[PDB]
Homo-oligomer: A and B are copies of this chain.
Amino acid sequence: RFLKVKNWETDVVLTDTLHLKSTLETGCTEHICMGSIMLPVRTKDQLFPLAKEFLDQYYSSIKRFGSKAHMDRLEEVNKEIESTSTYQLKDTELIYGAKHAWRNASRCVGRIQWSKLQVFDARDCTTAHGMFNYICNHVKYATNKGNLRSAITIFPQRTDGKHDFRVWNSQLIRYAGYKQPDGSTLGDPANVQFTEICIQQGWKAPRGRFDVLPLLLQANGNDPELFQIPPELVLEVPIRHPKFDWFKDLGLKWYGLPAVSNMLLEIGGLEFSACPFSGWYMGTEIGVRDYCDNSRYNILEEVAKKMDLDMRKTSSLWKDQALVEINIAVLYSFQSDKVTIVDHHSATESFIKHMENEYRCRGGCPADWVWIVPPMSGSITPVFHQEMLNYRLTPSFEYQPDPWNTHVWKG
Interface residues of A (CB under 8 A from B): 3, 5-6, 8-10, 19, 22, 25-38, 283, 288-289, 292-295, 300, 314-317, 319-321, 323-324, 327-328, 331, 335, 343, 345-346, 368-370, 373-380, 384-391
Contacts and interface: CB of A to CB of B under 8 A. Distances in A.
Given A321-B324, A327-B320, A38 B314 contact: no
A377 to B, nearest CB: 5
A280 to B, nearest CB: 14
B379 A379 contact: no
Contacts of A374: 378
B343 A328 contact: no
Contacts of A346: 314-315
Nearest first, the 10 closest Cβ-Cβ pairs linking A and B are A35-B35, A375-B379, A28-B28, A36-B369, A314-B345, A33-B390, A315-B343, A32-B391, A25-B30, A375-B378
Given A323-B380, A327-B320, A378-B378, A32 B36 contact: no
30 contacts: A6-B38, A19-B31, A19-B32, A22-B32, A26-B32, A28-B28, A28-B33, A29-B30, A33-B34, A36-B369, A38-B387, A283-B315, A288-B380, A292-B379, A293-B385, A314-B343, A314-B346, A315-B335, A315-B343, A315-B345, A316-B328, A317-B328, A317-B343, A320-B380, A323-B380, A375-B384, A376-B377, A376-B379, A377-B377, A378-B378
**Which interface residue of A3, A26, A300 has the most chain B CB atoms within 10 A?**
A26
A379 to B, nearest CB: 3
A3 B26 contact: no
Given A25-B30, A35-B390, 8 more contacts: A26-B28, A29-B30, A36-B389, A283-B315, A314-B345, A314-B346, A317-B328, A319-B345
Contacts of A5: 37
A25 to B, nearest CB: 5
A92 B127 CA distance: 73
**Which interface residue of A9, A19, A369, A377 has the most chain B CB atoms within 10 A?**
A377
B32 A29 contact: no
A379 B288 contact: yes
Contacts of A391: 31-33
A32 B390 contact: yes
A377 B26 contact: no
Given A320-B377, A345-B319, A389 B33 contact: yes
Contacts of A323: 377, 380
**Which interface residue of A10, A315, A387 has the most chain B CB atoms within 10 A?**
A315
A319 B370 contact: no
A26 B36 contact: no
Contacts of A328: 316-317, 321
Contacts of A33: 26-28, 33-35, 368, 389-391
Contacts of A387: 36-38
A329 to B, nearest CB: 10
A19 to B, nearest CB: 5
Contacts of A321: 324, 328
Contacts of A26: 28-33
A380 B296 CA distance: 12
B315 A331 contact: yes
Nearest to A30: B25
Given A314-B346, A323-B380, A35 B370 contact: yes
A76 B385 CA distance: 48
**Which interface residue of A36, A331, A335 has the most chain B CB atoms within 10 A?**
A36
A332 to B, nearest CB: 8
